[PDB]
Amino acid sequence: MQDIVEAAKQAAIAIFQLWKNPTDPEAQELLNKILSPDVLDQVREHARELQKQGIHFEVKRVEVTTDGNTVNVTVELEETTGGTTTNTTYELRFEVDGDTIRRVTVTQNGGSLEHHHHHH
């Protein structure tokens, strides 16, 4: 595949599909095809833990783009945790090797740098 942008989008969302349900056939399969088999495995282990936390997140916005050779997926989610729904942006930064992606850097951002952002 040269479709690293398309694959990175599907990869990012599929990782969140595992966090709610690590037994998802579509999610686990596509991750095994496009990313390393190591990546889907480390995701599903922690996915059981985030499910056991009961972290209800809701995927609001998905924006996938290139950053040199490394493809970045900036996805905004509203996470309802502790009874409070807050915006939390995950940037899954997929570092590529030839045709396939080996490494993924999940950056959990979310802070008040803005000016009175209307939540929901």
Side-chain angles (χ1 to χ4, degrees):
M1 64 175 185
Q2 66 186 270
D3 307 71
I4 304 297
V5 188
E6 213 300 287
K9 177 191 176 185
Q10 296 300 90
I13 306 174
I15 290 175
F16 296 107
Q17 298 181 32
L18 297 191
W19 292 4
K20 64 182 63 178
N21 186 89
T23 57
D24 191 290
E26 310 305 278
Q28 70 184 214
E29 183 189 285
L30 70 85
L31 294 177
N32 192 22
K33 298 171 59 176
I34 65 189
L35 308 183
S36 301
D38 311 273
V39 177
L40 75 91
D41 189 69
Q42 61 172 29
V43 169
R44 70 172 185 142
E45 305 297 278
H46 297 116
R48 300 181 60 199
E49 303 183 77
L50 302 177
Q51 180 186 90
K52 188 179 74 296
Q53 282 291 90
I55 303 175
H56 189 84
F57 50 86
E58 213 286 86
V59 182
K60 307 308 302 179
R61 174 68 66 86
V62 179
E63 293 180 60
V64 57
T65 183
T66 50
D67 163 62
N69 305 89
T70 304
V71 60
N72 292 220
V73 188
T74 304
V75 52
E76 179 67 271
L77 304 80
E78 284 183 63
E79 308 198 287
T80 308
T81 181
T84 50
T85 315
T86 185
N87 289 97
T88 312
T89 309
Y90 290 75
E91 297 178 51
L92 298 76
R93 199 167 192 134
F94 298 96
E95 197 289 308
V96 316
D97 176 77
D99 190 273
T100 180
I101 304 173
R102 307 299 175 126
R103 302 172 179 116
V104 52
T105 312
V106 182
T107 310
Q108 184 184 31
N109 295 328
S112 300
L113 290 306
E114 43 55 62
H115 293 263
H116 57 262
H117 70 125
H118 64 109
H119 180 72
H120 165 52

